[PDB]
Amino acid sequence: MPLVSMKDMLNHGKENGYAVGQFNINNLEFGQAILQAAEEEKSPVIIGVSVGAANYMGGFKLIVDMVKSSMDSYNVTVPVAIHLDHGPSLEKCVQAIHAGFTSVMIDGSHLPLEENIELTKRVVEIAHSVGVSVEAELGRIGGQEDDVVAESFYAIPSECEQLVRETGVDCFAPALGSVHGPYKGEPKLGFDRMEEIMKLTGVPLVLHGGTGIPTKDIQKAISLGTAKINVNTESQIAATKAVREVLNNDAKLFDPRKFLAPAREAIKETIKGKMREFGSSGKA
Amino acid sequence: MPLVSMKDMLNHGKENGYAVGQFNINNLEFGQAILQAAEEEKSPVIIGVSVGAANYMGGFKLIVDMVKSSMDSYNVTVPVAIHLDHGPSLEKCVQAIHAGFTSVMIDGSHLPLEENIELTKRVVEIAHSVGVSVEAELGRIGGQEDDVVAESFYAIPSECEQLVRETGVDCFAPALGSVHGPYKGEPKLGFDRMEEIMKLTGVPLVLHGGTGIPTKDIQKAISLGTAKINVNTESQIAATKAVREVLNNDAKLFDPRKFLAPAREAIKETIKGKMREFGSSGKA
């Protein structure tokens, strides 16, 4: 019943026209919500961890132990991967792998293409010694404060062809108009480039900034080889709304469990919704 | 640093005129705050766990795993016990011990003396097979519901003498006016009876209902052999006020960690104050 890499689940997704969601563990409470969503939807799932979330929770190894303890406690039978989101360095990837992560994203996208390929290739060499999956990136994900995405931040498909051939990465994140947080207007996704990058790379693609992409775009991204979609802030927002609401309705409430339990129910419903939109439901 | 039973820490307390606090882990990140409070105060500490809290967090084994993982990642050097609070049955004591609990309270105080004695003796037999410490009770702790504490609820000292002698428990909780949650007014602790119970039993005594027990009352309980004092609702009340405040002062906050972080800080400061008040600061 144990943890798995993203390799088999993203290939099964690419083969059958669906996407696995990655949902980031914000804090320890979230972890349980993500697993019971996946268990209830008979969905594979990817638990994303940021370096910042890891610092908040007490490290990579505590998060692995707690996901493994939770899978045991809730009888989780669906495929679960633990993935380092936007890993900044070889050192952090090694540390995440040593802690028991099953997957890493080495984000070399801020580097020159050759430096990115070198760094990525070194992480792959490590990861593939021990059954770990690797994600890499080209181009740049919109920041919340950036307004519309500069055309210069879009991945160039011929660079994507080279990076994936030269590194051996299992899956690839081309930045094609994605943003972190609320889309300012319509999402401007480069579907023609996505199709090219799909065709040139032959690996499962990854869509960052899945919060606010409508079923039309999601369904289009999946048709063009997207097998992994990252949804983070939608869950954070559903959690905090649920807390604000129970505090505002009941001034006497003093047991944190009475505001954490509604938070958990909201996170779980958000995630089940996405597992249903992505077509991961019933695939486990 | 391994977990330890309550045996040595409560003896050191009794012998030097201080008490060890029990702080109940309400949810997974209360645990962090309790261990950080202990480490910073160089204090022993007891992490209390209810059956209700274990049900919320995913069971006894997951809680023990998480406490050990946290101890490991925050380099905890102080003595830490994990104690089953008001254990309702031999079955729950066994399930807690099997999961790695170092201490149980078997609460037979609603049964006839002779049944409480027999139940307690059976749990001691099990617990003392594997270096687990045991707490028992006579008389009954009130609730904010019934206000004034009936005299029929106070432990009878000759019954305390018989139960402790017949069972071999390590420590003992006499209900002597304690209440869970807030006091109607001033607490009516039976200190003459407490002193008698200390002399006739010769084991460290436990004070339940420590939330909102004035300082003089606490200091007097320690002087008459209370070496363990349970504080729960104070910490719940401090976490929830920090959460209300931060959400009230920022309408656009959406990242749960931004409300969790000051909750953790309010808990830790609450628990540090208790550790100075009981005198366990500096004792580790």
Side-chain angles (χ1 to χ4, degrees):
Chain A
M1 6 255 137
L3 293 160
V4 297
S5 80
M6 312 198 303
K7 231 264 190 289
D8 280 2
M9 55 172 75
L10 299 196
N11 283 335
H12 290 142
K14 159 179 189 84
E15 286 158 19
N16 295 273
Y18 70 81
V20 185
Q22 159 180 323
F23 309 90
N24 284 18
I25 179 162
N26 182 257
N27 63 74
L28 291 162
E29 306 278 330
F30 257 65
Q32 313 216 149
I34 297 161
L35 292 165
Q36 199 60 47
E39 192 60 25
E40 285 172 17
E41 291 291 335
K42 290 160 101 226
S43 182
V45 74
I46 297 162
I47 296 172
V49 193
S50 71
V51 170
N55 299 3
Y56 184 82
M57 286 180 268
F60 294 140
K61 168 89 149 97
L62 190 148
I63 292 184
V64 177
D65 291 347
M66 118 97 212
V67 170
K68 288 168 68 168
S69 295
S70 304
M71 290 173 67
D72 218 308
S73 146
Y74 298 132
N75 300 142
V76 172
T77 47
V78 301
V80 180
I82 308 174
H83 177 79
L84 174 70
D85 202 15
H86 50 264
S89 64
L90 184 138
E91 293 77 9
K92 284 292 164 218
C93 291
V94 171
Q95 285 165 190
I97 288 170
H98 186 253
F101 275 54
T102 60
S103 182
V104 299
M105 176 190 200
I106 178 55
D107 189 354
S109 66
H110 278 57
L111 299 174
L113 182 68
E114 251 56 60
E115 291 176 32
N116 181 356
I117 292 172
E118 179 145 270
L119 172 51
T120 299
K121 181 175 188 196
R122 280 195 202 171
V123 171
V124 171
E125 193 186 12
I126 298 160
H128 288 197
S129 303
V130 287
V132 170
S133 55
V134 187
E135 184 180 322
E137 176 163 327
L138 275 178
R140 170 161 165 192
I141 304 301
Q144 228 312 137
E145 288 223 50
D146 191 42
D147 247 348
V148 311
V149 191
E151 186 60 40
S152 70
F153 296 165
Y154 285 58
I156 129 173
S158 75
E159 294 197 2
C160 303
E161 188 289 312
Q162 187 191 344
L163 186 149
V164 170
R165 185 171 32 74
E166 276 180 27
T167 59
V169 288
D170 307 290
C171 70
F172 181 71
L176 296 167
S178 282
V179 181
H180 288 136
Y183 280 94
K184 201 312 207 151
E186 261 321 316
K188 207 271 163 43
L189 302 176
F191 289 112
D192 288 342
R193 286 167 280 191
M194 186 175 300
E195 188 167 27
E196 248 227 289
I197 294 168
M198 178 201 6
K199 282 192 275 241
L200 270 34
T201 65
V203 300
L205 302 177
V206 184
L207 183 61
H208 282 58
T211 295
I213 300 175
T215 328
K216 257 260 236 191
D217 288 0
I218 288 304
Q219 277 341 288
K220 187 78 194 300
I222 295 175
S223 63
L224 293 193
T226 305
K228 170 172 180 277
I229 306 173
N230 291 19
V231 164
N232 184 23
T233 57
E234 195 168 330
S235 294
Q236 291 178 214
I237 293 163
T240 305
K241 169 139 69 247
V243 172
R244 277 180 200 282
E245 180 181 318
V246 286
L247 263 20
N248 286 338
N249 296 340
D250 170 4
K252 318 242 74 174
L253 185 167
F254 65 91
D255 175 2
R257 292 191 290 252
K258 300 319 282 267
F259 72 71
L260 298 168
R264 218 223 301 280
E265 193 63 26
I267 297 153
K268 195 176 79 164
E269 284 319 303
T270 295
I271 294 176
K272 289 171 68 172
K274 293 301 193 184
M275 287 165 169
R276 284 185 271 110
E277 182 181 8
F278 297 167
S280 58
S281 302
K283 294 297 188 304
Chain B
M1 198 96 296
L3 293 166
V4 295
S5 84
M6 299 195 309
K7 179 143 204 104
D8 289 347
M9 57 175 72
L10 292 203
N11 282 158
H12 297 330
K14 181 190 162 55
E15 289 160 16
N16 290 281
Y18 72 85
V20 185
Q22 173 184 311
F23 315 89
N24 283 18
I25 181 170
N26 180 263
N27 60 78
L28 287 177
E29 25 203 306
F30 240 73
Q32 255 69 345
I34 295 157
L35 298 162
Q36 277 163 353
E39 190 63 28
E40 291 168 15
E41 285 294 319
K42 301 265 108 283
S43 166
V45 69
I46 305 150
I47 297 165
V49 189
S50 59
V51 170
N55 293 336
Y56 186 81
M57 280 178 270
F60 295 142
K61 174 117 155 69
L62 186 152
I63 294 165
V64 170
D65 285 350
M66 129 91 204
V67 162
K68 287 165 84 151
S69 292
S70 303
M71 277 172 77
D72 213 329
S73 88
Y74 302 122
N75 286 320
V76 173
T77 53
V78 301
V80 175
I82 311 182
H83 180 72
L84 180 69
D85 206 6
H86 49 81
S89 64
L90 177 145
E91 295 67 18
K92 286 286 157 124
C93 289
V94 171
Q95 294 164 180
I97 288 173
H98 186 257
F101 272 56
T102 56
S103 187
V104 300
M105 179 188 190
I106 181 57
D107 187 357
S109 60
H110 275 59
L111 306 165
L113 222 203
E114 231 50 63
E115 293 177 28
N116 182 5
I117 289 176
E118 189 194 60
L119 181 53
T120 300
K121 190 175 168 163
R122 276 173 200 190
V123 172
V124 172
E125 232 203 316
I126 297 164
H128 289 187
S129 296
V130 288
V132 169
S133 62
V134 188
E135 182 192 323
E137 182 169 322
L138 285 171
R140 103 104 113 154
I141 311 303
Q144 177 218 135
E145 215 145 45
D146 219 314
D147 278 16
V148 220
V149 200
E151 260 289 334
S152 68
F153 292 172
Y154 284 53
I156 302 157
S158 68
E159 289 192 4
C160 302
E161 188 282 328
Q162 182 186 344
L163 180 152
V164 167
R165 170 167 41 78
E166 275 182 24
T167 61
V169 282
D170 304 284
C171 68
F172 177 82
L176 293 170
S178 276
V179 186
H180 289 315
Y183 287 107
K184 209 306 192 80
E186 243 277 330
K188 220 69 220 309
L189 299 184
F191 294 119
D192 289 339
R193 278 174 282 195
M194 183 172 150
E195 183 164 26
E196 210 71 334
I197 294 166
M198 163 195 77
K199 292 161 175 169
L200 297 159
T201 63
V203 299
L205 303 182
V206 181
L207 176 51
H208 282 54
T211 289
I213 296 191
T215 229
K216 91 179 235 185
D217 278 10
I218 290 284
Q219 277 145 192
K220 202 182 170 55
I222 296 166
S223 59
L224 302 175
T226 307
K228 166 171 181 285
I229 299 179
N230 295 9
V231 178
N232 178 24
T233 50
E234 202 177 315
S235 303
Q236 299 186 205
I237 288 169
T240 303
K241 281 199 218 134
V243 175
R244 288 181 184 288
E245 183 169 286
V246 164
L247 293 179
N248 278 350
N249 294 335
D250 187 347
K252 20 192 53 164
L253 187 161
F254 63 84
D255 171 8
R257 279 178 230 149
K258 297 286 191 193
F259 73 70
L260 269 4
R264 165 143 88 198
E265 262 288 308
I267 294 157
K268 203 178 78 175
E269 291 311 296
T270 298
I271 301 183
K272 291 187 109 214
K274 292 311 187 182
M275 295 176 160
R276 300 211 215 84
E277 190 175 0
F278 301 168
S280 59
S281 316
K283 309 314 199 150

